Amino acid sequence: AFELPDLPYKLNALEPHISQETLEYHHGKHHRAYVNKLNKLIEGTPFEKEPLEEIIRKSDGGIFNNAAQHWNHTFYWHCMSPDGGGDPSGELASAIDKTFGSLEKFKALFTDSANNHFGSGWAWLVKDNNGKLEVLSTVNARNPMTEGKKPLMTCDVWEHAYYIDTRNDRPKYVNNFWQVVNWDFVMKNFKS
């Protein structure tokens, strides 16, 4: 029932910050696999016709892992852009200043979250039910929406996300992520 979404940009659009080869493997093999495995697992189960978000909220095991990874990568592609980088603007910028003190403090907090996460996972900027901004990392496929928190931005820190381009140097990859970060998408997410 689920499909691999097209990338929001060309395979070479994030160069030289994220390579074409990485996008070929990361989207064309890793994400594609999650979609295919998800579809097979949920066939003939209560999750067969459920929305993706509802599968994530109610499932466990392989169904959860593939469903959550599918959502997580779909979200991740929109968090980057050839037009990305620079600073946020408007109320997102204002809210970041209020919550974290400044943009550089927030960036440092997200960078540390991403760099210090042990093993596979995701670094997140989220909004809680009270509208308060928060930085946190999750293990493997886990997604903050299972704790009632809305994702605004994510950075994949599974080793496949960067090993082709930076090998073991995850911090260099996170710096590369900042050069392509799509603030327009983050702000769109912030404003609902």
- Which residues are part of a known binding site for Fe cation? 26, 73, 156, 160
Minimum Å gap between C-beta 29 and its own copies is 5
20 binds, among Fe ion, its own copies, none (CB under 5 to 8 A by kind): none
Contacts from 18-26 at CB under 8 Å and sequence distance 24+?
A: 18/80, 18/165, 18/176, 18/177, 18/180, 19/164, 19/165, 21/164, 21/165, 22/161, 22/162, 22/164, 22/165, 25/160, 25/164, 26/73, 26/156, 26/160, 26/161
164 binds its own copies (CB under 8 A): yes
Stretch 113-142: interaction string toward its own copies, x if CB under 8 A: -----xxx------------------xxx-
- Told to check if 33 binds its own copies by CB under 8 A, we report yes
Q: Least separation, in Å, of the C-beta of 45 and its own copies?
A: 18
Q: Which amino acid is at 143?
A: N
Member of 121, 151, 156, 183 binding Fe ion (CB under 5 A): 156
Binding positions for Fe ion, rule: CB under 5 A? 156, 158
